[PDB]
Write a protein that binds this ligand. Structure first.
Ligand SMILES: *[C@@H]1O[C@H](CO)[C@@H](O)[C@H](O)[C@H]1NC(C)=O
Ligand SMILES: *[C@@H]1O[C@H](CO)[C@@H](O)[C@H](O)[C@H]1NC(C)=O
Ligand SMILES: *[C@@H]1O[C@H](CO)[C@@H](O)[C@H](O)[C@H]1NC(C)=O
Lengths: 681, 49
């Protein structure tokens, strides 16, 4: 195989508002002959071309001849754009040197089509809404008004809608990931075994998964259950290490998670029912005769989980576990804790805060065993309304809070917030005895889509645990893949500007995705549907922010370089010191949040080495290869510092700074930004 | 596994495990597991064999 020509281009990068970056073209000859090659670029009015070599053409080169061919351009649009360049060799031009054959094969002219991405100005976000219309052989309609424009940015706000009932899950690329006994700290054993348990339910039920690896996961669990035998308490409770703390209770998330799968896993190796009923009588002894018991919870415990330590939600955690054992007075006990939860549910009905984490998981499952849970099918709609989500996930930002207290969507819990929410939400969806064809099924299919789209089994997710929990969603949907859905649904999408696009859904459009956008600055979405069964349609309004925002209590102490380039060798190598700590770190969840990215045309080499070196008393040495993660440590203020440099990939650049800031410390206050750009420019 | 054992010594000793859970701690789990073992063997109607 051989070709006497090839193109080396400039992969620009997700680039900045100033679109004048550097773009060149370098065509090189490997055949020993000299050949002329005319060159031009197929352009369009979508961007503002500026000719550098306006008057003279990059003309003619020979064997191993080097020529840079670059132009200037300052586009107006945003998004993926492909530049179509062409280069052709002609005949009868023996004047560059002595001779030009210029007779190639059917690959006559050289052309390249380079899709370059451009990042819009400022920081990107959205604000979606959630809407449900389900007539029973009739018609229901609603209006959605989409307006929150404070401190707008020019030409960023757009939107779209969709609805789905997806079947046809792709494949199993990401189901393969592994970890082992913590070399560093045994405290991580809790977050080890908490997800490894339900791998039992994932072997056959998927039909796509690789059950070899979960069959090995149960091999690890054959030691895990002995660790639990060693992590138990004599009285019946559980902790990180076990007994010698007698008169006290322990966390119930992991024991409630694991007791049902000990009941399903008492087949391979025998665990007696004594081990279940001792935990049970431990659950039974703590209940008062009249009162909803007190339980002071240690909040921000890195070993166990990150939460809010609301003792009533723990009183509900015991009872989701009680719901399994078929004792029939146990169900009156879960009714008592359901009255405590009814306190919590009125707190939810106010719609201000119930921590948005726990009752979500428990309300469905408590009644999903019984079979009269249409009330819970109704509250799961309210759970679905509580999300600023992508088409399948949540990314970053609650809309425009005037109200100070918000429960849990942009807390220091930062596994990107989509997985640990959507997982328990799907657990809530499809535990139903009756045919769940109604909106819960459709939303479950909405969740499964991006889970199937994750075609990377790395394990270097935005988080580190939650890739384990993401495989709950695809897996439990394996049995729910069989259903009956598709009706005389005729959807109508209208807005103020005399526009009306019609849509329809059936059993063959059950899996069809409808994407349609509108560019109007007003936002209004009146809908009208028909048919039978209940299905949920979703919105998404993408828009950038942060042209220039004020300073705020957070202290991102970033230092770029010694105050300027002011020299011919700078603008390439300059180490950026960052020293950061929000003093607010009190009792939310393990240190999870960080974002640090590269500005447009700068590549990291040594930063990787430094981060590999960094460790603050405890560490996971997690990485993204454009970011850095050394944060997981105990409750402490008193920041540290660093320095990391780059190299110049972009020779020329227009003026606007790139910035990489995520910031979540407490809910009452403003979310506390702090910034400083790059001075060399 | 699927068989019972003599009850003279366990019946003799369970009450004094309840009296002897003061010096060194035996949990009530150890009592109630023997108890549920005593409870599982009873038929609904018959005097078990
Ligand atoms: C540009 O390239 C992208 C990425 O493959 C592709 O999706 C798009 O269709 C291309 N546009 C064309 C053909 O100009
Ligand atoms: C395997 O999983 C399927 C659902 O995917 C379920 O219907 C079946 O009962 C499971 N076990 C068997 C019998 O194959
Ligand atoms: C934070 O700084 C304070 C300063 O008084 C210090 O007492 C504390 O140990 C530091 N870490 C914690 C516990 O937040």
């Amino acid at each position: 195989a051989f070709q006497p020509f090839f193109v080396e281009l400039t992969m620009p990068y997700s680039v900045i508002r100033g679109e004048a970056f550097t773009l060149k073209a370098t065509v090189l000859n490997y055949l020993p002959k000299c050949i002329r090659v005319s060159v031009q670029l197929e352009a369009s009015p979508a961007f503002l071309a500026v000719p550098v070599e306006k008057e003279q053409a990059p003309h003619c080169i020979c064997a191993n001849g080097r020529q840079t061919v670059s132009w200037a351009v300052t586009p107006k649009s945003l998004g993926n754009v492909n530049f179509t360049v062409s280069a052709e060799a002609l005949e009868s031009q023996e004047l560059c040197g002595t001779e030009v054959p210029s007779v190639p094969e059917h690959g006559r002219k050289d052309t390249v089509i380079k899709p370059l991405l451009v990042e819009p100005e400022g920081l990107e976000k959205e604000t979606t809404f959630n809407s449900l219309l389900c007539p029973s052989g009739g018609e229901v309609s609603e209006e959605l008004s989409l307006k929150l424009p404070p401190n707008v940015v020019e030409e960023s706000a757009r939107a779209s809608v969709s609805v789905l009932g997806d079947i046809l899950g792709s494949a199993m690329q990401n189901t393969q990931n592994l970890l082992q006994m913590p070399y560093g700290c045994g405290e991580q054993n809790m977050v080890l075994f908490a997800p490894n348990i339900y791998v039992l339910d994932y072997l056959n039920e998927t039909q796509q998964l690789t059950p070899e690896i979960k069959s090995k996961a149960i091999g690890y669990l054959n030691t895990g259950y002995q660790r639990q035998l060693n992590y138990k308490h004599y009285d019946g409770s559980y902790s990180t290490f076990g007994e010698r703390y007698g008169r006290n209770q322990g966390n119930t998330w992991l024991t409630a998670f694991v007791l049902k799968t000990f009941a399903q896993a008492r087949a391979y190796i025998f665990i007696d029912e004594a081990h279940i009923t001792q935990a049970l009588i431990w659950l039974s002894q703590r209940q008062k005769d009249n009162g909803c018991f007190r339980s002071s919870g240690s909040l921000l415990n890195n070993a166990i989980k990150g939460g809010v330590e609301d003792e009533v939600t723990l009183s509900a955690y015991i009872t989701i576990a009680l719901l399994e054992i078929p004792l029939t007075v146990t169900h009156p006990v879960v009714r008592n804790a359901l009255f405590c939860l009814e306190s919590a549910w009125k707190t939810a009905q106010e719609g201000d805060h119930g921590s948005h984490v726990y009752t979500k998981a428990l309300l469905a499952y408590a009644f999903a065993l019984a079979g009269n849970q249409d009330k819970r099918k109704e509250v799961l709609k309210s759970l679905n309304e509580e999300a600023v989500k992508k088409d399948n996930s949540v990314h970053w930002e609650r809309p425009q809070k005037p109200k100070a207290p918000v429960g849990h969507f942009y807390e220091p819990q930062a596994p990107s917030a989509e997985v640990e929410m959507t997982s328990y939400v799907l657990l809530a969806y499809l535990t139903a005895q009756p045919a769940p064809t109604s909106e819960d099924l459709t939303s479950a299919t909405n969740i499964v889509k991006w889970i199937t789209k994750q075609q990377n089994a790395q394990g270097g997710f935005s988080s580190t645990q939650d890739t384990v929990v993401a495989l709950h969603a695809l897996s439990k949907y394996g049995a729910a893949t069989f259903t009956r859905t598709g009706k005389a649904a005729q959807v109508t999408i209208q807005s103020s500007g005399t526009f009306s696009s019609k849509f329809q859904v059936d059993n063959n459009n059950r899996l069809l995705l409808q994407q349609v956008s509108l560019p109007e600055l007003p936002g209004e979405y009146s809908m009208k549907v028909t048919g039978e069964g209940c299905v949920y349609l979703q919105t998404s309004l993408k828009y950038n922010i942060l042209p220039e925002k004020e300073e705020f209590p957070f202290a991102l102490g970033v230092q770029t370089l010694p105050q300027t380039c002011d020299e011919p060798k700078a603008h390439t190598s300059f180490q950026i010191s960052l020293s950061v700590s929000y003093t607010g770190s009190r009792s939310a969840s393990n240190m999870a949040i960080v974002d640090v990215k590269m500005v447009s045309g700068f590549i990291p080499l040594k930063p990787t080495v430094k981060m590999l070196e960094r460790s603050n008393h405890v560490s996971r040495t997690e990485v993204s290869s454009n970011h850095v993660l050394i944060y997981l440590d105990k409750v402490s203020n008193q920041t540290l510092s660093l320095f990391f440099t780059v190299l110049q990939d972009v020779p020329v650049r227009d003026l606007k700074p790139a910035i990489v800031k995520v910031y979540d410390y407490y809910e009452t206050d403003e979310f506390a930004i702090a910034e400083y750009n790059a001075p060399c420019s």
